[PDB]
Amino acid sequence: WTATSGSCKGRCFELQEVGPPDCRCDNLCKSYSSCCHDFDELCLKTARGWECTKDRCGEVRNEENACHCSEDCLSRGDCCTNYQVVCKGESHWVDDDCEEIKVPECPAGFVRPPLIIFSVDGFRASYMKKGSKVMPNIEKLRSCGTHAPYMRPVYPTKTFPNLYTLATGLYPESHGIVGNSMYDPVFDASFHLRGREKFNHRWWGGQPLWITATKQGVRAGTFFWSVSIPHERRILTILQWLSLPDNERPSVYAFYSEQPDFSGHKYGPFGPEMTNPLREIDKTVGQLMDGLKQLRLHRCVNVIFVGDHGMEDVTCDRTEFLSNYLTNVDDITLVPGTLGRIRAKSINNSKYDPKTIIAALTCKKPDQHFKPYMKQHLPKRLHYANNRRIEDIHLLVDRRWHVARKPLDVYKKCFFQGDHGFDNKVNSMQTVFVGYGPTFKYRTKVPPFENIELYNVMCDLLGLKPAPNNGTHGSLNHLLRTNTFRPTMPDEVSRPNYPGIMYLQSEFDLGCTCDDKVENKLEELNKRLHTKGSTKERHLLYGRPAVLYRTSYDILYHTDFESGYSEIFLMPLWTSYTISKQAEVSSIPEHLTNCVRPDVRVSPGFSQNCLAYKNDKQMSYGFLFPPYLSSSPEAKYDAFLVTNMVPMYPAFKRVWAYFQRVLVKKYASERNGVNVISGPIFDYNYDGLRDTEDEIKQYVEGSSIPVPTHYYSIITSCLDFTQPADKCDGPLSVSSFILPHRPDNDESCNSSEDESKWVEELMKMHTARVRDIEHLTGLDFYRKTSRSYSEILTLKTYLHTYESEI
Numbered sequence: 001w002t003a004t005s006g007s008c009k010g011r012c013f014e015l016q017e018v019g020p021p022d023c024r025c026d027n028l029c030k031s032y033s034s035c036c037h038d039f040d041e042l043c044l045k046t047a048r049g050w051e052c053t054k055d056r057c058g059e060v061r062n063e064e065n066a067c068h069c070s071e072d073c074l075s076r077g078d079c080c081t082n083y084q085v086v087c088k089g090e091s092h093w094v095d096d097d098c099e100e101i102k103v104p105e106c107p108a109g110f111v112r113p114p115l116i117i118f119s120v121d122g123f124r125a126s127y128m129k130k131g132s133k134v135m136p137n138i139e140k141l142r143s144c145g146t147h148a149p150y151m152r153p154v155y156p157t158k159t160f161p162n163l164y165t166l167a168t169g170l171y172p173e174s175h176g177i178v179g180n181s182m183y184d185p186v187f188d189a190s191f192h193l194r195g196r197e198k199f200n201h202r203w204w205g206g207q208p209l210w211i212t213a214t215k216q217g218v219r220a221g222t223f224f225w226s227v228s229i230p231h232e233r234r235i236l237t238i239l240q241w242l243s244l245p246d247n248e249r250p251s252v253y254a255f256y257s258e259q260p261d262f263s264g265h266k267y268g269p270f271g272p273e274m275t276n277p278l279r280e281i282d283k284t285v286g287q288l289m290d291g292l293k294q295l296r297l298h299r300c301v302n303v304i305f306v307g308d309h310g311m312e313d314v315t316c317d318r319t320e321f322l323s324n325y326l327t328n329v330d331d332i333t334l335v336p337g338t339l340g341r342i343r344a345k346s347i348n349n350s351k352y353d354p355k356t357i358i359a360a361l362t363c364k365k366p367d368q369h370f371k372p373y374m375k376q377h378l379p380k381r382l383h384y385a386n387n388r389r390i391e392d393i394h395l396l397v398d399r400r401w402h403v404a405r406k407p408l409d410v411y412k413k414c415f416f417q418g419d420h421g422f423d424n425k426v427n428s429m430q431t432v433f434v435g436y437g438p439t440f441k442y443r444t445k446v447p448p449f450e451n452i453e454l455y456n457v458m459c460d461l462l463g464l465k466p467a468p469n470n471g472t473h474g475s476l477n478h479l480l481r482t483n484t485f486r487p488t489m490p491d492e493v494s495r496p497n498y499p500g501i502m503y504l505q506s507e508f509d510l511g512c513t514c515d516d517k518v519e520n521k522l523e524e525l526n527k528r529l530h531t532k533g534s535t536k537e538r539h540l541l542y543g544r545p546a547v548l549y550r551t552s553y554d555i556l557y558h559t560d561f562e563s564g565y566s567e568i569f570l571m572p573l574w575t576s577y578t579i580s581k582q583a584e585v586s587s588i589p590e591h592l593t594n595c596v597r598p599d600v601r602v603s604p605g606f607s608q609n610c611l612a613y614k615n616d617k618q619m620s621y622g623f624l625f626p627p628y629l630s631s632s633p634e635a636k637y638d639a640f641l642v643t644n645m646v647p648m649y650p651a652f653k654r655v656w657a658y659f660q661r662v663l664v665k666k667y668a669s670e671r672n673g674v675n676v677i678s679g680p681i682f683d684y685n686y687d688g689l690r691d692t693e694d695e696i697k698q699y700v701e702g703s704s705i706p707v708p709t710h711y712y713s714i715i716t717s718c719l720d721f722t723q724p725a726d727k728c729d730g731p732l733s734v735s736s737f738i739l740p741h742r743p744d745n746d747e748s749c750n751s752s753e754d755e756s757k758w759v760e761e762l763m764k765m766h767t768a769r770v771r772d773i774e775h776l777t778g779l780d781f782y783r784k785t786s787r788s789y790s791e792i793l794t795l796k797t798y799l800h801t802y803e804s805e806i
């Protein structure tokens, strides 16, 4: 019940929502059908429209009017946004030359520059160039302010997951809004786009910016607007709030536009119809900026212009149907469209089988436009698994397509030419970022970054401490003139041991053999040097990674590589080596194919054993530093140490062997040398965070040797590729991956071909940030460089995407 017999008199767009059954006057009351009876009359005035004309200048105040052109309107904070232009001979903000804002220029009693977030739904990154002719206000913000060529959304590239990521700094798996449609099996309740359940607080996790502000004594404008409140009224309401007295005035505000998404769905991203929506959003920006200039705030307020996601060409005729794959289509529920999520129709049907659904949907048709995944096998860069609202079965849909259960769902449940929701590295899903104001830089381009980073920056702009989030605070310092965050490197928790030669070969009973018993003051003086760290400045270029948890490990040095060997996991946490442009690739000699050698620096009881592999009929082994890249025949023996061996399924060794034998050399050749750091990852509970030993679900049979879920590599070089990787004076360039350690290559539909036709394609799908690897390993990389920490944090958030240029 709502007792809507109350009144909105002097309460229009009140900032604190009043508790039912009293009637509401806030900017969401429409959407809850709860507004007082007189809300339209008092709070949504429209008479005379939105612009002053000469004949109204100096008019008598008439309180029916949507906005005012009377002499008292500046005092009342309720002039039409063009009042000073029409009535006082002022220029529109967009026609003024831009002038650097070196310091805030704020009216008296402003404690801090306000922040205004201008969010646009469906605003695809390439609109900034392709629509430049019809968006002069936006193009000024962009050229005068700080901008990125694009901003990467989170997956799925849907509206509510991305807006709530912008507000929280959290991935959807953590904030809980994982899709526009959701079933939570603990609540036994569903969340829908249309309806009243979605406003139940239990859906929304984390701490959004407005709650962060409020808890720290900063007032916030209400971020959400009911769809029927026109844009001109949203802008006027913001400008009115900005005229409140100091103690009541908010410091942070959001505006939302449903365009260009709304039109983009109907017409496609570049439909002729899309010009007018872009003109209209620009006009809105112009209203806001003219309004700020009237209040003397246009050199005081920080403005962020930001989108949620882009828009791709999608039509009804590009729909795959699960009815063409499965027989049992009626025993499943599908969340359809630009992604698929599948679960059982009934929990009381114990005949439904995920393994057979996956198999029926895997590489079944030559042109197939979706790929099925168990959620834990999705690329780790999507961070899309650790939530009970995410179904175990996921379909990654190719850009430009849909998936649906049955044809009747598409014509009885073409009306549309655009959609979004695809993998967040697709170019069409990228969106926009512009920052304009005193705290932002002047006429500055920054590299593309992820939207999870913005919460921390918005907190910095407002003097707030961010709640714990998935941004890397300090990675976006280069966007700001002032208010930078000055991060400190994490402390190392575990110090390494540096073992010498401590065991005779006969103390080991590992069931390993090697044909290595044939053998100066030349190169026995000199191999002592290589086992104490003489080559270490060549192979470890950025310091030892720091171990950020409590453990026991040893640093091991070799001619061609250095490792951090875990006595707990029986294998390296990391292995570091440098491959110069000139380095040569060699084979594994026939007499050394099955060679494994005890490491006399590491006890038998903290070593792997070859018997375990012999008895495990599913599991083989590989090496972290590849024997193919040995510097010399004698150095090659080091690569067959038991301390460089790791468990690998035969199917995975196909990928790994190709990476190590063919790709590393190709990269050194292209990048003028590369430094490689490789290692294992254990993430059996798919939380994106390193597993403790008691979380490991699989071991090499009969042993304490844990099986990794993934293998990583971080590949670093000089950004100025005229310098070799091992003598780089300036900024670095990095690419990284996190490959799933799987016992088949079913993910790769062309895997029965030569590795040269499928492996690199796999590796690109599994591209990763260094920060993703940090989370998964408890390691901290690049501890000793000559670069600023903030720059290193930017490098660690970089993703190499392998998309063409926008």
Ligand SMILES: *[C@@H]1O[C@H](CO)[C@@H](O[C@@H]2O[C@H](CO)[C@@H](O[C@@H]3O[C@H](CO[C@H]4O[C@H](CO[C@H]5O[C@H](CO)[C@@H](O)[C@H](O)[C@@H]5O)[C@@H](O)[C@H](O[C@H]5O[C@H](CO)[C@@H](O)[C@H](O)[C@@H]5O[C@H]5O[C@H](CO)[C@@H](O)[C@H](O)[C@@H]5O)[C@@H]4O)[C@@H](O)[C@H](O[C@H]4O[C@H](CO)[C@@H](O)[C@H](O)[C@@H]4O[C@H]4O[C@H](CO)[C@@H](O)[C@H](O)[C@@H]4O)[C@@H]3O)[C@H](O)[C@H]2NC(C)=O)[C@H](O)[C@H]1NC(C)=O
Residues within 6 Å of the ligand: 170, 171, 173, 174, 175, 176, 202, 203, 204, 205, 206, 383, 386, 387, 388, 467, 468, 469, 470, 687, 688, 689, 775
């Ligand atoms: C991205 O960033 C995020 C944010 O930092 C990272 O996410 C965090 O990761 C932590 C480690 O996994 C995780 O720690 C949990 O916390 C459990 C308690 O959780 C509740 O409280 C949170 C705090 O809220 C308050 O925050 C501020 C202070 O910061 C306060 O001032 C306010 O008053 C706030 O209320 C709250 O955020 C959290 O939210 C989740 O759950 C809600 C449902 O209740 C959802 O609405 C919401 O969306 C969140 O859901 C996500 O996270 C949960 C896990 O919490 C996950 O299940 C969902 O899928 C979803 O992803 C909660 O309301 C705490 O109990 C845990 O402790 C257990 O483990 C430790 C291990 O060391 C034990 O020592 C400890 O004893 C305990 O064990 C006991 O229970 C075990 C399991 O039941 C059992 O086996 C054992 O035997 C014991 O009985 C642990 O600390 C954070 O909660 C989490 N935060 C968020 C927001 O997600 C994330 O890691 C980052 N991602 C990457 C890749 O880096």
Ligand SMILES: O=C(OCc1cc(Cl)cc(Cl)c1)N1C[C@H]2CNC[C@H]2C1
Residues within 6 Å of the ligand: 117, 119, 163, 164, 166, 167, 223, 224, 225, 226, 227, 254, 255, 256
């Ligand atoms: O007004 C809205 O959103 C504004 C906003 C901006 C930012 Cl940056 C963060 C968030 Cl959480 C929200 N919305 C209005 C409703 C229309 N469709 C669904 C709802 C989203």
Ligand SMILES: [Ca+2]
Residues within 6 Å of the ligand: 682, 683, 684, 685, 686, 687, 688, 689, 690, 691
């Ligand atoms: Ca884990």
Ligand SMILES: [Cl-]
Residues within 6 Å of the ligand: 156, 158, 178, 179, 180, 181, 335, 339
């Ligand atoms: Cl969805």
Ligand SMILES: [Cl-]
Residues within 6 Å of the ligand: 650, 651, 654, 744, 745, 751
């Ligand atoms: Cl295979």
Ligand SMILES: [Cl-]
Residues within 6 Å of the ligand: 551, 568, 691, 692, 693
């Ligand atoms: Cl551990």
Ligand SMILES: [Cl-]
Residues within 6 Å of the ligand: 126, 427, 428, 806
């Ligand atoms: Cl593009």
Ligand SMILES: [Zn+2]
Residues within 6 Å of the ligand: 122, 159, 261, 262, 265, 420
């Ligand atoms: Zn949309």
